[PDB]
């Protein structure tokens with residue numbers, strides 16, 4: 001009861017991957033766990049229906065392990081109000097919002113720990129290292145975020161074409177640290193990671209700035225190993241993915257010790273080889 | 281109220297420890313970027329040999345962790361006094377009797393000898409049961425330091441996994457690395473070899489590698505990669521075989537713990553941690 005938790009997540013392979021459930025059996029099998037998604041009936045009503053789906057991935061494997069050792073059950077659902085989390089007119093949306101407004105006890109996914117989020121939710125210890133990296137075609141001369149080509153884009157002709165997926169931790173960091181770069185980049189906003197990789201591969205974009213762990217995963221699976229992260233996998237603003245909990249959550253301590261036990265006992269290494277290993 | 285008691289440990293490039301000048305002050309020096317090195321007076325034992333009395337002398341401390349301390353103190357508005365951990369160790373929990381006791385900085389923090397540990401202190405389950413760690417101020421891991429010429433593939437090399445007295449490897453006693461090897465049954469063969477050769481400090485182990493008295497030193501990559509970038513007769517091998525972070529240590533009921541963690545996150549995010557890396561950690565090759 002107090003042991004059965006509402007938990008929110010968000011699709012982002014390979015950390016969280018969503019699949020359609022078997023029409024029959026309507027049962028999740030294999031490495032997957034049940035996760036529901038609220039889907040609107042139409043755009044003229046507030047009516048919707050939870051659709052039963054199945055979730056798997058690195059972070060889902062983490063959740064299963066935490067459920068086993070911290071001893072809780074859960075009702076996993078996919079966020080529909082935004083994505084990871086952004087403060088809009090001083091109100092948090094996304095996974096962060098679900099936790100802040102007490103719709104979820106915790107958020108599990110590719111959720112980046114940062115200062116402004118930590119003001120409104122508590123984060124577990126980081127369990128996946130990440131930060132901001134830059135993906136380019138192999139050989140592209142860029143030192144890092146601080147490269148003049150990004151910092152002062154119009155000092156070059158033609159200027160470097162580079163973008164991120166807006167509204168997440170990466171854009172927030174850039175907007176705060178590099179105001180001119182940021183207002184320049186918005187014209188190259190990408191709707192999502194898949195769009196961005198297509199833009200890079202066909203030469204519509206010179207660089208894609210995004211979450212380090214996801215880019216390292218994409219670099220590992222790239223056809224031809226032609227897209228790479230710069231600086232031999234350099235990372236600005238090193239941080240990690242964390243489990244977000246409500247401020248003052250009584251679950252935080254056990255969750256932290258659990259994650260640290262998984263790391264210390266080498267259980268994280270196998271999840272990494274399992275989900276995050278790539279050919280390139 | 282009161283000044284915070286900060287405990288730290290000698291561990292270049294995070295904490296350098298040098299004698300004061302005759303007048304009891306610290307010599308003014310400059311970073312590789314030309315800025316003045318911020319130094320603080322830190323008291324510590326001048327005898328560091330095991331089994332010996334630990335009467336302290338004022339000394340001079342500076343480095344990555346001292347710059348971080350100074351930033352924290354200014355940010356959160358506390359004053360402090362720094363001392364070096366008396367037994368010279370990071371801190372493990374050992375059987376006594378049926379008692380268990382924490383030694384090193386862990387022991388000083390838990391006993392009230394210190395109010396905050398500001399050092400390259402590894403976050404692990406064992407310590408986190410007893411103290412509060414901040415979000416990591418440094419992400420790193422473990423690697424292996426050897427003499428240039430020495431060929432081993434890494435942690436899975438047969439000379440480590442099937443050891444003999446022909447090839448000696450070790451770590452630092454009463455460190456997180458000592459714990460890592462004792463904890464994992466899959467590593468017990470390596471642990472039993474290492475417990476015969478472990479060193480009292482990283483500096484002595486590194487020197488022993490240079491002197492060909494130690495063939496491999498397993499330790500923090502942030503430290504070993506720095507040593508290798510400075511001593512061309514030394515190299516790391518195998519890259520990281522395990523990932524870990526350093527965090528600020530405080531008692532579970534410290535009033536400072538929320539804002540220390542927030543300040544750490546802020547510093548990663550605005551490039552301050554990067555500046556410390558450029559200043560202290562990565563400027564040579």
Ligand SMILES: N[C@@H](CCC(=O)O)C(=O)O
Nearest residue numbers: 084111112168169170211
């Ligand atoms: N992991 C990021 C999303 C991707 C990004 O913006 O880099 C977040 O939690 O916002």
